[PDB]
Design an enzyme around this catalytic site. Structure first.
Site, PDB file in Angstrom:
ATOM      1  N   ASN A 198      -0.524  64.540  18.412  1.00 47.43           N
ATOM      2  CA  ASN A 198      -1.972  64.526  18.552  1.00 47.43           C
ATOM      3  C   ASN A 198      -2.581  63.151  18.313  1.00 47.43           C
ATOM      4  O   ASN A 198      -3.809  63.022  18.335  1.00 47.43           O
ATOM      5  CB  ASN A 198      -2.581  65.560  17.592  1.00 47.43           C
ATOM      6  CG  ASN A 198      -2.450  66.971  18.105  1.00 47.43           C
ATOM      7  OD1 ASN A 198      -1.391  67.577  18.079  1.00 47.43           O
ATOM      8  ND2 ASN A 198      -3.529  67.550  18.574  1.00 47.43           N
ATOM      9  N   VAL A 243      -7.566  60.068  18.907  1.00 46.70           N
ATOM     10  CA  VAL A 243      -7.255  61.261  18.127  1.00 46.70           C
ATOM     11  C   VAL A 243      -7.775  62.471  18.885  1.00 46.70           C
ATOM     12  O   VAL A 243      -8.959  62.529  19.236  1.00 46.70           O
ATOM     13  CB  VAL A 243      -7.877  61.191  16.723  1.00 46.70           C
ATOM     14  CG1 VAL A 243      -7.503  62.417  15.917  1.00 46.70           C
ATOM     15  CG2 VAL A 243      -7.430  59.932  16.014  1.00 46.70           C
ATOM     16  N   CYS A 244      -6.903  63.445  19.125  1.00 47.70           N
ATOM     17  CA  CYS A 244      -7.237  64.601  19.949  1.00 47.70           C
ATOM     18  C   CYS A 244      -7.306  65.856  19.086  1.00 47.70           C
ATOM     19  O   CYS A 244      -6.297  66.285  18.517  1.00 47.70           O
ATOM     20  CB  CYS A 244      -6.139  64.603  21.019  1.00 47.70           C
ATOM     21  SG  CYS A 244      -6.184  66.055  22.089  1.00 47.70           S
ATOM     22  N   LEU A 245      -8.494  66.450  19.010  1.00 47.32           N
ATOM     23  CA  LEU A 245      -8.715  67.691  18.285  1.00 47.32           C
ATOM     24  C   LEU A 245      -9.723  68.524  19.056  1.00 47.32           C
ATOM     25  O   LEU A 245     -10.536  67.991  19.814  1.00 47.32           O
ATOM     26  CB  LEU A 245      -9.229  67.443  16.864  1.00 47.32           C
ATOM     27  CG  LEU A 245      -8.228  66.926  15.842  1.00 47.32           C
ATOM     28  CD1 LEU A 245      -8.875  66.874  14.479  1.00 47.32           C
ATOM     29  CD2 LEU A 245      -7.022  67.832  15.821  1.00 47.32           C
TER      30      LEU A 245
END
Ligand SMILES: O=P(O)(O)O[C@H]1[C@H](OP(=O)(O)O)[C@@H](OP(=O)(O)O)[C@H](OP(=O)(O)O)[C@@H](OP(=O)(O)O)[C@H]1OP(=O)(O)O
Ligand SMILES: *P(=O)(O)OC[C@H]1O[C@@H](n2cnc3c(N)ncnc32)[C@H](O)[C@@H]1O
EC number: 2.3.2.24
Lengths: 76, 988, 291
Positions: free
Chosen positions: C135, C142-144
């Site tokens: 992630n 940053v991937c959320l």
């Protein structure tokens, strides 16, 4: 009670509501079929813009009434 | 089709419609204001041949409605059709325009009309219209018929396309795409859409399927659906087919529709009008009765009613009463409408004419192309609200005086005309809408008074080739000149008394110094014609701080809107949110595309990263440090550097001549379109499964496949050529057009090998090698920076983007897209056309009069329209909203509190003054985005003993600043109650 | 030791630092490296007012509710004048390959906040050369779900009424830095418990361990950011013995699989890199002055 919501581009949406419902809940019901967030939609009835916090009985909306959904544009 | 001129229009009409537009002849009768508007819009649209016809002669009264005549034409008594022919043809050299003057009467032989394909009639007596309509609709094939007229402030429109008309596209919206999740072998079958993403379908529509595993019989078929649930629907019997495995995509199919019309004679007894205002659904029938009575009176007495003669009003009312009972529906008779129609029968309102002309032009396009759904069958627009609020004016105020404003004076009266001539109006932007607004202002005589009045228009852009299609004030010999100067010069020709001041600034926070508060206070109304929402919000915020009316409008394709903002009465622009563009999820864009837009966006981002960001970083890094030996020494001492690896890698792989650029392009092709697929398949094999057992490569994901290079394919050659040219441009390597031949590229690549598919020390070694080879000269530490230019046909940007997008799409087995669609998606070009802009400009000009007159709240209207359906909606503007905080204290968005200070005023004194004057105490003072007092953050406790003058750090030109405050809630743990902005004066 | 570490570090969780200075012409000069410089310079609009109230309310929570323990902690810094600039430092949890690291993030609040989620970017990427987590892309993104706006689910979006920045911080710390980051990737969890999955996870863990030992301790000690200089110096000084023991254990564990054939070369390379990093880290720690 049955009402219709006709948006521009000809799409017709069928809704089930009862008097005493609140405009914000009526418009949140639209999201369940369109995905449009409540804060992004304006709906018009009988030449008046339906304000938040009111109920359908105040605007005297009855069975088989038609409401329009409108949006603003950006090009120029 | 020369796309450089019709780039915007193709996105709306389409290639087939534009093909049908050519080879079409249109006959236009009556060169009044409305006829001139229709002719202008049609000529701008691009009809092959237009014939204009008129029989009267120019008069002084015509100067107030026609924006092409001149005093010389009136003096010479030229024919109206001939005097405008030369100017109209200048609008578009590709259109053949001709004039005619054969008399029209009861005995005229109508055989010559069969040559044309559409007839538009204006300023004609009713019996002649009946005869012509009867003749036209009986031809094989039928000839389309359209009628339009404007009397004072009332307008009438009519259409007739024959007994049966065929429509090839009902709505013009592109079909959507859905993903199938489950099918059932039942009678009838049940189809369940994917999780979330409702299908948004309706009963009766038709769908087609493709890429279905197991139920192979459904692929390529057409079915009619029946909606059951938001996430499911039904299709025909499927019990005889194989079980459904997985996959499947369904896409809506468009279907032709047939509509029916009726003759003009039959429609006069029970019209099928179109409702534009739902507060009075019965108005159109009454207006129809009144107009019919007016026509009967004009036939009977051979003249129009005189203003103020009560016997004429009584006679007209009696005629209307006699007519009404004969109608099929037997409606009532509205005395007010008849009275006002009698009062202003001889006037002419320009903005209403412009709006009706735009609508009629759209109808003509629908008739010739069959693209959209036509009007059926009447339309009645009016501007009664302008005169409804005048009360009972005297008849002397409406009499003509002998100048060019006679029509407007007869429409609205002398007092409102004089109040119009003293306006100070500020107009933002000079795009498509700006030119129309300027033309309407010139016709209305806005700001022509010697004593007071001025028009300010600002636009930083320059004239471009594609702009000439929509903006009629510009000419081919005006390219690469400021828009504002050209617009001012063109407008000054229409009206000599117009006073226009033109600027070249762009309205933004940086230029706030020139557009100070005194400038806004001087103005009386602000009109925007912008194309982005940030400028709209900034202008609205600026107007909100000085209590000035604002008028806003915008269009996109065949849709448009207008909005009206008035101080102390309505909400502002910021009170509503606008839909932003949805972001593509990062993984979908980077690794798992599923539609052509994803590949186009990937190509655009790759272009930006490869040719803009990296050269900028390279130049910045090599200008930070003077010499490469110094950098090598600093690296050898263990000193860290920012981005050193990337820049040293770029330096190592620097090409030196054309052949190395070609080799670099070949390597980039291989790396982009071959290795990525192999790596992705290696990480995720085709047969890998999730926890529940479903295959990982299921919808909407599509498995990739490697692509092998081959110079015979045009796509590969195009990509190679464009990439080589771009790299050579960036690295500043000279080249010639002969080197771009296929033979030369083949010879160059004949000795280039391809590597197979599978740090500090290496960087130091490479840098040292560059040092010892004398490759670190000053000229070598420079790279040109490119910028995206979608309107240039030779830079090669769009070709590279299209080639990359198509190659990536074929890698993922997706249907490719042509050059124009790629250009539209990459450049985010907004489709536009002249008709909608003309209509919205007319409506805005109509609302400006109401704003000027100071009418009450109930007079203003907002319009949302879509000419493709067609549909028009008029609503009342949003009422202001009361907001309270505590102790019954309430405020609106137009309120503003003031506090007077002095040289030794302190922050504590400011708090005490606010608390004493208004009753409540602030708890947080913030100036814009820079905070001044927040108790939570450290060090602000001591700020209570500081001079406000130091604490603000202002500029000497401003004598006050604006601050925002907040108040503690009644119950702890809740958000602070917002308050109105507070203005602080430094001294008395 | 843990009580002393908690007591010392509690005074440094929230503070302010000077990052942007203005000249007479209103131009902005950044005294520290910031990832969102262009957006700050371009977006000069002062129309936003609800953002100020929301941030002022949030600062109340951020001053006391930040996580703090020997295992992991969070530190926040913000500009002395502006409110849309922040820097966040997070220490890696225990019993994970990210143990006792110091990872730095950049946070920017857009103009229309809280109608849109804030932007977060990772800065301890080691010059974009390392992908620390499935992630955490190597370019810094940053991937959320909570930071994204897409179809997804109504309860998996940035909800203006309920979502808060503290939720973003806690979600990052609890969900991204986990015991076995290799299985965060969907499609791999099927092979959990199989020997092949175990071998792949061991290889991934070895790579991550060497990467964090290089770019999360040594570089931070050598070239600390001006904002968090004191925090880093006091953090590494108090935990030198534990860091040494952890590094020795990591070196010992990796070599246990050097005799394998499928991943033997990778394990040997990782062990050599880890030894080379630890050799210099020892000298760096021994020379650290007492704060
Ligand atoms: O800089 P970006 O636009 O983000 O593109 C990079 C870049 O590729 P190009 O320079 O060829 O455009 C990387 O190569 P380097 O310059 O860093 O050497 C490459 O890395 P690899 O060569 O290791 O493949 C990476 O691809 P990836 O992230 O798959 O490793 C790729 O990213 P995108 O092509 O996805 O933008
Ligand atoms: P459409 O895109 O046809 O025309 C819009 C024109 O408005 C100008 N414009 C955009 N934004 C601004 C600002 N902020 N200030 C002044 N003028 C602006 C464009 O350049 C087009 O000419």
């Amino acid at each position: 009670m049955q009402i219709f919501v006709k948006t521009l581009t000809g799409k017709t949406i069928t809704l089930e509501v009862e008097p005493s419902d609140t405009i914000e809940n009526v418009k949140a019901k639209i999201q369940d079929k369109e995905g449009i967030p409540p804060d992004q939609q304006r709906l018009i009835f009988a030449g008046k813009q339906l304000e938040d916090g009111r109920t359908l009985s105040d605007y005297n909306i009855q069975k088989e009434s038609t409401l329009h959904l409108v949006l603003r544009l950006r090009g120029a | 089709i020369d796309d450089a001129l019709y780039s915007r229009q193709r996105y709306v009409l389409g290639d087939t419609a534009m093909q049908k537009m050519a080879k079409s002849h249109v006959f236009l009768s009556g060169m009044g204001g409305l006829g001139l508007e229709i002719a202008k819009n049609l000529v701008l649209a691009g009809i092959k041949a237009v014939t204009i016809h008129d029989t009267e002669k120019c008069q002084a009264w015509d100067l107030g409605t026609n924006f092409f005549l001149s005093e010389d034409d009136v003096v010479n008594k030229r024919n109206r059709a001939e005097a405008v022919l030369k100017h109209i043809a200048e609008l578009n050299p590709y259109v053949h325009v001709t004039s005619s003057s054969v008399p029209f009467n009861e005995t005229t032989d109508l055989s010559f009309l069969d040559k044309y394909q559409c007839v538009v009639l204006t300023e004609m007596k009713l019996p002649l219209q009946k005869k012509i309509n009867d003749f036209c609709r009986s031809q094989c094939p039928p000839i389309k018929f359209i009628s339009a007229d404007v009397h004072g402030i009332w307008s009438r429109l009519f259409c007739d396309f024959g007994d049966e008309f065929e429509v090839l596209d009902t709505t013009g919206e592109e079909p959507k795409e859905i993903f199938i999740s489950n099918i059932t072998q039942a009678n009838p079958g049940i189809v369940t859409c994917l999780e979330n993403h409702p299908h948004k379908l309706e009963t009766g529509q038709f769908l087609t399927f493709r890429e279905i595993n197991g139920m192979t019989g459904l692929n390529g078929s057409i079915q009619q659906i029946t909606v059951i649930s938001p996430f499911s629907f039904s299709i025909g019997d499927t019990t005889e087919l194989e079980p459904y495995l997985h996959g499947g995509i369904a896409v809506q199919v468009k279907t032709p529709k047939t509509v029916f019309f009726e003759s003009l004679e039959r429609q006069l007894k029970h019209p099928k009008c179109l409702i534009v205002d739902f507060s009075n659904p019965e108005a159109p029938l009454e207006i129809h009765t009144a107009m019919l009575a007016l026509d009967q009176f004009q036939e009977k007495y051979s003249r129009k009613p005189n203003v103020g003669c009560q016997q004429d009003s009584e006679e007209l009312l009696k005629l209307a009463t006699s007519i009404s009972e004969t109608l099929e529906e037997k409606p009532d008779v509205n005395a007010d409408i008849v009275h006002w129609l009698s009062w202003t029968a001889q006037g002419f309102l320009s903005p209403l004419a412009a709006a009706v002309g735009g609508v009629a032009s759209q109808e003509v396009l629908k008739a010739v192309t069959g693209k959209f759904s036509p009007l059926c069958q009447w339309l009645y627009l009016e501007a009664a609200d302008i005169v409804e609020s005048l009360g009972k004016p005297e008849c002397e105020e409406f009499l003509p005086r002998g100048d060019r404003y006679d029509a407007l004076r007869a429409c609205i009266g002398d007092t409102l005309c004089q109040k119009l001539q003293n306006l100070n109006i500020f107009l933002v932007g000079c795009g498509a809408i700006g030119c129309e607004m300027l033309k309407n202002f010139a016709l209305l005589g806005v700001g022509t008074s010697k004593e007071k009045g001025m028009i300010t228009v600002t636009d930083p852009d320059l004239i471009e080739k594609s702009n000439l299609n929509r903006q009629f004030l510009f000419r081919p010999h005006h390219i690469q000149k400021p828009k504002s100067y050209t617009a001012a010069d063109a407008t000054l020709k229409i009206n000599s008394q117009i006073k226009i001041d033109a600027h070249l600034n762009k309205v933004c926070p940086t230029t706030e110094t020139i557009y100070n508060d005194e400038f806004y206070t001087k103005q009386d109304v602000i009109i925007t014609a912008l194309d982005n929402v940030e400028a709209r919000r900034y202008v609205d915020s600026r107007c909100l701080a000085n209590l000035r009316p604002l008028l806003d409008s915008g269009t996109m394709g065949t849709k448009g809107h207008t909005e009206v903002i008035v101080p102390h009465l309505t909400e502002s622009y910021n009170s509503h949110r606008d839909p932003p563009e949805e972001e593509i999820p990062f993984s979908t864009l980077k690794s798992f595309p599923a539609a052509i837009e994803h590949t186009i966006q990937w190509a655009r981002d790759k272009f930006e990263s490869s040719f803009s960001h990296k050269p900028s970083l390279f130049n910045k890094f090599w200008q930070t440090y003077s010499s490469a030996e110094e950098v090598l020494q600093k690296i050898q001492s263990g000193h860290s550097l920012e981005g050193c690896f990337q820049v040293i890698k770029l330096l190592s792989r620097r090409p030196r001549n054309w052949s190395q650029c070609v080799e670099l392009a070949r390597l980039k092709f291989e790396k982009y379109f071959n290795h990525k697929a192999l790596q992705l398949l290696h990480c995720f094999p085709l047969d890998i499964r999730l926890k529940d057992g479903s295959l990982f490569w299921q919808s909407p994901k599509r498995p990739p496949s490697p692509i092998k290079f081959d110079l015979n394919e045009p796509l590969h050659l195009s990509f190679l050529q464009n990439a080589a040219k771009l790299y050579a441009t960036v690295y500043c390597i000279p080249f010639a057009e002969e080197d771009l031949s296929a033979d030369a590229l083949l010879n160059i690549l004949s000795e280039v090998k391809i590597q197979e598919f599978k740090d500090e020390r290496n960087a130091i070694f490479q840098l040292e090698k560059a040092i010892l080879s004398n490759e670190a000269t000053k000229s070598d530490l420079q790279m040109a920076v490119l910028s995206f230019e979608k309107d240039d046909d030779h830079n090669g940007h769009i070709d590279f983007i299209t080639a990359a997008s198509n190659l990536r799409a074929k890698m993922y087995s997706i249907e490719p897209a042509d050059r124009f669609k790629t250009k539209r998606i990459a450049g985010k070009i907004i489709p536009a056309i002249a008709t909608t802009t003309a209509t919205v400009s007319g409506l805005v000009a109509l609302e400006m009069i109401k704003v000027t007159g100071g009418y009450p709240f109930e007079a203003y209207k907002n319009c949302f329209l879509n000419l493709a359906i067609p549909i028009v909606v008029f609503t009342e503007t949003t009422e202001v909203r009361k907001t309270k905080i505590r102790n019954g204290i309430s405020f609106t968005i137009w309120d503003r509190w003031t506090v007077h200070g002095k040289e030794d005023f302190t922050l504590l004194d400011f708090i005490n003054a606010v608390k004493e004057k208004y009753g409540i105490e602030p708890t947080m003072v913030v100036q814009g985005v820079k905070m001044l007092y927040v108790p939570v953050m450290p060090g602000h406790a001591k700020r209570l003993k500081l001079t406000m003058h130091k604490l603000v750090k202002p500029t000497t030109e401003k004598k006050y600043v604006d601050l925002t405050v907040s108040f503690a809630p009644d119950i702890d743990g809740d958000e602070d109650l917002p308050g109105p902005p507070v203005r602080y004066y430094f001294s008395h | 030791l843990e009580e002393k570490y908690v007591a010392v570090m509690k005074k440094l969780q929230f503070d302010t630092f000077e990052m942007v200075s203005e000249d007479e012409d209103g131009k902005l000069g950044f005294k520290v490296n910031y990832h969102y410089m262009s957006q700050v310079k371009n977006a000069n609009d002062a129309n936003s007012a609800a953002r100020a109230r929301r941030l002022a309310q949030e600062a109340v929570t951020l001053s006391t509710s930040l996580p703090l323990s020997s295992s992991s902690s969070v530190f926040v810094r913000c500009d002395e004048e502006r409110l849309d600039i922040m820097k966040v430092l997070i220490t890696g949890p225990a019993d994970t390959p990210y143990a006792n690291g110091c990872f730095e993030f950049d946070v920017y609040f857009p103009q229309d906040y809280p109608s849109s989620p804030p932007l977060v970017n990772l800065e301890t990427t080691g010059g974009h050369s390392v992908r620390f987590n499935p992630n955490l892309y190597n370019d810094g993104k940053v991937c959320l779900s909570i930071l994204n706006t897409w179809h997804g689910r109504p309860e998996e979006k940035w909800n203006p009424q309920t979502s808060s920045f503290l939720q973003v911080l806690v979600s990052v710390q609890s969900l991204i830095l986990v015991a076995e980051p290799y299985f965060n990737e969907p499609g791999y969890e099927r092979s959990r418990g199989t020997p092949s999955g175990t071998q792949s996870s061991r290889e991934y863990d070895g790579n991550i361990r060497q990467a964090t030992v290089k770019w999360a301790m040594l570089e931070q000690i050598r070239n600390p950011s001006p904002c968090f200089k004191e925090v880093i110096h006091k953090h590494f000084y108090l935990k030198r013995v534990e860091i040494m023991a952890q590094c020795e254990e990591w070196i010992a564990d990796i070599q246990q699989y050097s005799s394998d054939k499928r991943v033997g070369r990778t394990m040997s390379h990782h062990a050599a890199a880890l030894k080379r990093h630890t050799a210099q880290l020892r000298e760096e720690l021994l020379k650290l002055p007492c704060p």
